Design an enzyme around this catalytic site. Sequence first.
Site, short mmCIF file in Angstrom:
data_model
loop_
_atom_site.label_atom_id
_atom_site.label_comp_id
_atom_site.label_asym_id
_atom_site.label_seq_id
_atom_site.Cartn_x
_atom_site.Cartn_y
_atom_site.Cartn_z
CG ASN A 219 -90.19 10.40 30.52
OD1 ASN A 219 -90.55 11.45 30.00
ND2 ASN A 219 -90.59 9.28 30.05
CB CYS B 183 -83.98 22.30 36.82
SG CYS B 183 -83.92 21.85 38.32
CG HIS C 6 -86.65 14.10 31.97
ND1 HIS C 6 -85.44 14.51 31.70
CD2 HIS C 6 -86.86 12.84 31.88
CE1 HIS C 6 -84.95 13.71 31.05
NE2 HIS C 6 -85.41 12.49 31.01
#
Lengths: 268, 269
Positions: free
Chosen positions: A190, A227, A192
């Site tokens: 995804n 982050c 991330h």
Amino acid sequence: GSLTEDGLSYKEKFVVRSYEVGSNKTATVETIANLLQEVGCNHAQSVGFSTDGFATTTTMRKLHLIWVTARMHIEIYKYPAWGDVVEIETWCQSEGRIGTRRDWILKDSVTGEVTGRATSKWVMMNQDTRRLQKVSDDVRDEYLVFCPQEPRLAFPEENNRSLKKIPKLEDPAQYSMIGLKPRRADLDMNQHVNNVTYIGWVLESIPQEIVDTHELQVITLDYRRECQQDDVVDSLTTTTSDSQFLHLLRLSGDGQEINRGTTLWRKK
Amino acid sequence: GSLTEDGLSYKEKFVVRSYEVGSNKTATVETIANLLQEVGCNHAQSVGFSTDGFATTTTMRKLHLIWVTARMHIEIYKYPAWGDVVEIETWCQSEGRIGTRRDWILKDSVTGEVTGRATSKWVMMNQDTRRLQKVSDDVRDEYLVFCPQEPRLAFPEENNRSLKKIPKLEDPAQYSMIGLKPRRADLDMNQHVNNVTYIGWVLESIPQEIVDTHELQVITLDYRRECQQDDVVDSLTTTTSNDSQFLHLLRLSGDGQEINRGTTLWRKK
Ligand SMILES: Cc1occc1C(=O)NCc1ccco1
Ligand SMILES: Cc1occc1C(=O)NCc1ccco1
């Protein structure tokens, strides 16, 4: 891997790979953490949940709701050596409206001895607004049928290390590693940053002399904010003591906190 | 995994893991490269060589001699999806005193179709001085008994891509990613930066728009000097070209000392 006979837990065996070991020729804590995530993902798949790390249902998908890790706590007694087979058992348990827990037990396949254990706390959040929301009764019922009803804890003791509050490191830090940035291999499907990347970033500010003479026994890590792919991070560590450390990860510029944690190391 | 019936090659199956896949839900090229290294290491172990990535004998260890990768060339037709089983066959072949080759073929376990192939060139070097030396007859004889005698090439064609010379990128580069540093997870058991880390660093300077609309078909990478644990790297890329081709260069952030050069070829999805 497979669900167990009662269908309330999942087990999988892994053979430790050459690129998975550190200078001790045993699996790193990041390899262990990846294997925990892998068995967790295989357990979700086995009973029909999403496999993207958010363990969602069709109901949660329509509402743009996801499960997110709030805390990871891992205790390792013996790191598996290269070529060894480690068996990992995992299960999920609701802790009311607050959130849900996923626990793990690691064993040496050959001896059957418990070589490690881990626990994690998860909370439900809208993926777009990032706002937390209590678990609805209709979505709680969806996953309760895959969890044990009686308490089953990898860390049973009332008020044990896994539940300890973590303070905020005060400047100046004793040690630091600055300008850490994720690369494409640190991202998931995804886009991330993978939860295991933050474990590696926490450990980057431990002096190499500690890593060479000690073994990591316990790591507790709180996840406060993600982050982003284009962010830069500073890893800070101060000795609090065996050797114990207090850790903090923050954005390189404004100093916005993303993670806090503690580690405990044993002399070899 | 296991050696094959004739004992001149090694095969191993792998199930693609959740954390091993990219945005396409298929294995990244770095996951593929790690699996190539893993099957290579398991083949060395199966016949008694060192398993540290230097494939040494007791004779080489007494002389402080090691094998080091000079070039990696990988061509992928189909990236395996999450949960798929990929079977990889590998073999080693000497190319005289120059150096030796290790080749790989990747197949879909279910269909048996070849989904990728790779080749690598290795040279012998003293690990302390880093001086290259020609393979001695006594070292050569030690590993020849584990290699096929007749030529067996993953890339048989005489003037093929795997052997093409790679030019040096000239400044200014079209794209760059600056200040890349290895972390402990990028190191191996000997505290050296893993060869796969350099593949990831090369790819960091490809624009995200190319990665989102294209798939990597071919990567050729020369290894000139190793990045130390405390070094910082700059990744540079310039488009050279339905297909997209790039020229790549990795150099030390300060003085600009070259560590790697390579080329990539991408096909539109
Ligand atoms: C850790 C967690 O927090 C909230 C939900 C979950 C979870 O894992 N759910 C999927 C699943 C598969 C088998 C049982 O549960
Ligand atoms: C790639 C390479 O270059 C020089 C030596 C090798 C190598 O792999 N040798 C070990 C081995 C195991 C089975 C056959 O050979």
